[PDB]
Amino acid sequence: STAGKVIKCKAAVLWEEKKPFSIEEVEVAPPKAHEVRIKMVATGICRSDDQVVSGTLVTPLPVIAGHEAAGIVESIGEGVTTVRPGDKVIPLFTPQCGKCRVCKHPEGNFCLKNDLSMPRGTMQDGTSRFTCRGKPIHHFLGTSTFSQYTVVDEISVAKIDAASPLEKVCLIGCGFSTGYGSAVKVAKVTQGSTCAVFGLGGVGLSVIMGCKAAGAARIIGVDINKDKFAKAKEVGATECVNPQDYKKPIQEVLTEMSNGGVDFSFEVIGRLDTMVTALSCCQEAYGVSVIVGVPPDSQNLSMNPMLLLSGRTWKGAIFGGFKSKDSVPKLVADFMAKKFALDPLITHVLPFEKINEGFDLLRSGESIRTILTF
Template identity: 65%
Template sequence: MNTSGKVIKCKAAVLWGLEQPFSIEEIEVAPPKAHEVRIKILATGICRTDNNATTGVMPAKFPVIVGHEAVGIVESIGEGVTSLKPGDKVIPLCVPQCGICSNCLKPDSNYCDMLDIVGKGVLSDGTSRFTCKGKPVYHYMNTSTFTEYTVVRDVAVAKIDAAAPPEKACLFGCAFTTGYGAAINTAKVTPGSTCAVFGLGGVGLSVIIGCKIAGASRIIGVDINPRKFEKAKAVGATECVNPKDHTKPISEVLKEMTGDSVRYTFEVTGNLDTMIDALASCHKNCGMSVVVGDPPASSVLTFDPMLVFDGRTWKGCIFGGWKPVNDLPKLVSDFMAKKFNLDELVTHILPFDKIEEGFNLLKKGESIRTVLTFQH
């Protein structure tokens, strides 16, 4: 059946408001307009950033379809789309690459002006492509992947190897790309160095993979959930520590463990206190701490300025520093060539209608990444 140019009715997980459960609804997905693409979603990961939208930590306009880590197939394209065609296997991008804004034109910046982290919830013309029960339903982070079909801008799509398995390749839409790039691109971890990763979820484990590939000799995983230690060691952590097992600040514990201090630290939880702990844990003069986790919206961080006056470097990281349209196809090709293994990151694969179960696994700390699959 040719659906090009027609409204598609399909199932989606709609959030009607804050602290509400996901509701599987029939929605209508409009055809793509100029420079837009409609995508049939094959698999999508559950990320803590999506959960943050349900609690207000990340801004969203309700009702909304969240989800931002997925693989799909291009179903149809709008006028003016030249880089993609129906049938292409793609990753929708929460960080677009328009190629013409001042940020995209900078070789060392990937913070495209079309990035939506303020929760506008609409596409370029100021409207949504989703409706449910006669009401508009809003987009999330340019992507909205908790639905059988979504519509995104063509600059927010990366074409990937057609043979890439969706259940693994979807992690390139956020978790792996962000964590791996934080080590490789943002920190530029050096061979023989010592690293500490605060938070051992899907992104944190991806940071560890990046540190290992970069040649770090010691990688310390830090988490208050010891059930994650086995996975962390499986991907490259040399040891793990639980701050709750110690009465001293974790920065002192790490200094005692290393005999000096850690050269690179990564904060991957989005917790404000942990950000300061991670900063204090890196070497006071030549250390670098990278903020990878999403901080709460409208929050303010208070810290001792001596932590940076002494010479530490404090950096933020958006999507691993990658130019996504250019770089994701290469990263997926590296994965297909077995440069890195993502098996340890995916702990659960569930059908899409089990989305609440997937989020419960996340909240209980029982999963690294749960991937939802669609039966079209």
Template identity: 65%
Template sequence: MLVLVEIQSLLPGQEKSISSTQRKCTFAEYTVVPEFTLAKIDAAAPLDKVCLLACGFSTGYGAAINTAKVKPGSTCAVFGLGGVGLSVVMGCKAAGASRIIGVDVNKEKFARAKELGATECISPRDFQKPVQEVLTEMTGYGVDYSFEVIGTADTMTAALASCNMSTGVCVVVGEAPSGSVVPMDPLLFLSGRTCKGTLIGGWKMRDSIPKLVSSYLEKKFNSDLLITHTLPIAKINEGFELLRAGKSIRTVLLY
């Protein structure tokens, strides 16, 4: 039996918090789940490719398409260029955004981001001022849409502050550690900014997964570009090391 596991982009040490139940279920040859959690997909779909659509890709792509409803000709900023962030980039491009600015401290991700649709990329470490000020100067007024795909209080605040003060929309995609508090200046909202969250990109998964798989087969998007490594499950630790080192976007494990 072939079991496919997609290693997600995790915060350092986060993989240690995965429960024993999750581990047993994920790496078993068989498992029992409620019928309503299953979705039937096209038998022609390659499982080692469409496994990304169950969470990472659908979350990022849907954040742009469904949650933000990015408009053609708009300007977007994506904070975090891991697998989910790059999926946001793909969603913004598909929606017709004219300018997509990727933000990440790991410059090795910039080439892949531009390949997927980013028009430019910046690292906060290259500036002496807050990155939200840099983005405001780059655009003249702030971005139309910002996406926080990292999961820290600082980047959530920066993403909101980088938005156009009148009509900007910030979508929080990243998951902050439990108990985190995000301090917000109320004035950021006073003139019209909007901040909203998204869960799995706003899809109703049982209905949407088969449609996303069909779109993949019709080549409406190429999520294969997010897969940088494919390893046997015996090398799962190598997969996590690639992840910690920032050398992988998505690693697919074959069992």
């Protein structure tokens, strides 16, 4: 029996910015009313977790990061109706409370209960379930998956198919759904269109998958790391360009390549300059540019609003525009029905104890997704 008891387990604690994760024993309190304690099975390394280490994505420290994961329900608090002990689950770093104006809106998904806009690093009730060396440790996006056990609010967890392979479908918790939805739900890429995708990591490859599923005729991958090009072509890029190879700015190159601008562009990096470049390279009268990358804390971009007055559309989205709790079980069912592939995103599978090695693979340009296994 662990139910109703404090669990002592292993977690990766980030005590301060720009330091390795500390793998050590934490205490995980039992779930309170409407909370779920999960035994983690697999978690991916997303660039957003690295941005917490870099300090470009601000959230209270010390913290248990990790938000792209899957595991099995260990216990439920009073009042929980949507999952049961032994269920396979994906934590939802964007919650779906079902009650707020956004959850009720046909097109909104950025639930007002999210912990991304103004991060507190707590449970919904403003407290933490984690202690380490006698110190309270913050949560991250209501998920905190870099731990053998986490506690999540019910609105931050989805039940998934009992037969799903958790070492793959953890990517539906972030990278796959974010990129794929950015193309199919947020941009609504059209058949025969020309798309430009800036950044060919796990999220950008998932954007390419979505553009190809939507029947784009041309998908131009843009990355400064030419080692990313082969995999981008495998999942649907028709051509790849490295801005470092050109004397002209890449917006000019992409405008000429697309005979006056692309139909859809996607920023999947998190730099202010590429967000402006991505907007500029879409057709000035009817182009659509989607910001997917997380921009650096408290920094403003500079842009000429004439880019919008001619007719461009600029938008961004969290988690691919998916209503998280409705969508994640459906995406897992679609994966089980072979409607899309996740293996092309997975370059490395490491034990959890090698989390730091996994982060160094990402930082060095050598990995797409490392999956950590508990």
